[PDB]
């Protein structure tokens, strides 16, 4: 792995980053092709490039792109990369969109608030551990029934929307033992959230609209924050009134209730809901396309495990007896990371290596990793583009080191020192719970795919119940 200069060019200072983003958003093949073509052009998995949003929302679009399993890990090393205000890349949404505060996700570990706020969330998680499984069953059973009816009535049932409502209803129940639907919020939370998220991420979001529409009004200037305050406040009122026990733990940690509510709202709506809104449909899709053989093997493992080690109910002890289910969730997180982009700013001069070279990174340079390419490295995973259910079973566990959906090796856990997802254990558990409730109720099912900015819109067409 001989030392080499990083290939790639940032081009003319204002012209290039705009041209590059047009390619990124409208070029044939999408952002995937954007990265694959440069890879081919430079015969390298590491190269220089501009990234959106460009020219007005961002004052520095320059980055070093990482696409292989060997160089990517640098993004985890907080001793070498700073993780300040780069949660969303080369720009940061306005803090007016977050109560005037810089919430946890944007804080570098060297910031006192990072440890405080993260500990606050660890509290919120731990403090709900006994509601997770019970509330999940209740919430998702509701969802499934609803889907069965809709299906029985129209032959087809869209999953996304109603799944989002379930996700949010589930979170209020688990996190705060509250049903958001039994409040002013009704079933509109998924809509209020998406709306608020649009304002934050518009600069880098592809809504599938014509460039002559997206460029002038989504990709050049930040959207006026005052327009979304009405919406934001509705969410704020909910959390402020139902997160009392967490808000108090905050003050004990040294954080005012105000700043607590804003951070809580963010973690639940942005971090959690945002990730689940994507993770679940994707998991449902991969499973659905796996075939009947897998459906039977899963239904079989899960039911037997529940009955033999759960005594009729779902319990941690039982989940531990479902090796295929565990692998199935891990494969879904590997093949299609819910949140693909991770950034890191070099705190000093150091070197990194890809599979065939070494590169010098100079202090201040922005490192960027497109996870989907990194976790599909053929030199790590055989048949990387295929969904292999038992990939992580038995000896497969030796690879968990490479599943990076949480912005860290799956084998590691979030700490106040690192920037790994604070709810890592929670999402893996609730995802396993999703698969579980799915195969207790059904033996098999079929789906059809649509198109959207979430990747794939899933629609259920058949539901063979257990009975
Ligand atoms: C499947 C759903 C989820 C996915 C895919 C996901 C993904 C991620 C990723 C990729 C990061 C790293 C961002 C970066 O610095 O570049 C992150 C950070 C974080 N996530 Fe999640 N997350 C999920 C659910 C949750 C949940 C449910 C919580 C709630 C407690 C949570 C809390 C956090 C926090 C607090 C951070 C920042 C931690 C820090 O500042 O060190 N996440 N998440």
Tab-separated table of C-alpha atoms in Angstrom, residues 4 13 19 24 78 137-138 144 162 170 173 176 184 189 220 234-235 326 355 396 442-443 461:
chain	number	residue	atom	x	y	z
A	4	UNK	CA	0.012	8.175	-3.033
A	13	UNK	CA	-14.437	27.660	-6.548
A	19	UNK	CA	-22.242	21.733	-11.416
A	24	UNK	CA	-25.341	14.404	-7.856
A	78	UNK	CA	-12.735	10.724	17.590
A	137	UNK	CA	-46.802	-5.654	20.698
A	138	UNK	CA	-49.829	-3.537	21.454
A	144	UNK	CA	-51.276	-5.284	11.530
A	162	UNK	CA	-49.603	3.716	8.708
A	170	UNK	CA	-45.083	3.227	19.786
A	173	UNK	CA	-45.892	4.664	24.703
A	176	UNK	CA	-43.110	8.206	27.971
A	184	UNK	CA	-54.100	17.193	20.037
A	189	UNK	CA	-47.220	13.622	13.913
A	220	UNK	CA	-29.660	27.451	-2.834
A	234	UNK	CA	-47.168	21.423	18.275
A	235	UNK	CA	-44.504	18.752	18.696
A	326	UNK	CA	-30.777	-11.727	14.775
A	355	UNK	CA	-7.152	-1.645	0.045
A	396	UNK	CA	-20.874	-14.778	10.552
A	442	UNK	CA	-48.175	-14.436	9.756
A	443	UNK	CA	-46.546	-17.425	8.062
A	461	UNK	CA	-50.451	-7.561	-1.348
